[PDB]
Amino acid sequence: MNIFEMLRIDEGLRLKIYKDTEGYYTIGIGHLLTKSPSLNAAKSELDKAIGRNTNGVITKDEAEKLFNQDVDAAVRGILRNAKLKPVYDSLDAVRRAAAINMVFQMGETGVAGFTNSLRMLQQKRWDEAAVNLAKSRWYNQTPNRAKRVITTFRTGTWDAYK
Numbered sequence: 001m002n003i004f005e006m007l008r009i010d011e012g013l014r015l016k017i018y019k020d021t022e023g024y025y026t027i028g029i030g031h032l033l034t035k036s037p038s039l040n041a042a043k044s045e046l047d048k049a050i051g052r053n054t055n056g057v058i059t060k061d062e063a064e065k066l067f068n069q070d071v072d073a074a075v076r077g078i079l080r081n082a083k084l085k086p087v088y089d090s091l092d093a094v095r096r097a098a099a100i101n102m103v104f105q106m107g108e109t110g111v112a113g114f115t116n117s118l119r120m121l122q123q124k125r126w127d128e129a130a131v132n133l134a135k136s137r138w139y140n141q142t143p144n145r146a147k148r149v150i151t152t153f154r155t156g157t158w159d160a161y162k
């Protein structure tokens, strides 16, 4: 199992603009277009991202291409973050995917706001980190996805995704 497969399960795939769990215009595999309430602003952003006049609809290939760029960016964001990098480099491969998932979902600032959890993961105190991760708006808002990511950090296996 890998990051792409993991995120494809967590995010789904939609070829027409839709609103995410927070009510924000998104498309494809969890690609946020804009936080603005305007559908046009969203369509504008979409056309700018695809490089053509899409009219709110994209193909599967286009979706996958945004997806590759977004995963790439998430990882790169982690590596560039002084607070995140050290933790990320301390993790094994499976857990790294859990870290990428979080950043992809909520951005680097967001995650960078989980200080205590970061420290606990860095110390490899899995169960404790798992409990601390659960005390968050993230877990309360998207509990089933949070549980899957949390189990992944807790166990270091893909069991939650099987």
Ligand SMILES: CCc1ccccc1
Pocket: 078, 084, 085, 087, 088, 099, 100, 102, 103, 111, 114, 117, 118, 121
């Ligand atoms: C807090 C989860 C995490 C860990 C390392 C890097 C990014 C994100």
Ligand SMILES: [Cl-]
Pocket: 049
């Ligand atoms: Cl883009």
Ligand SMILES: [Cl-]
Pocket: 141, 142, 143, 144, 145, 146
């Ligand atoms: Cl959920």
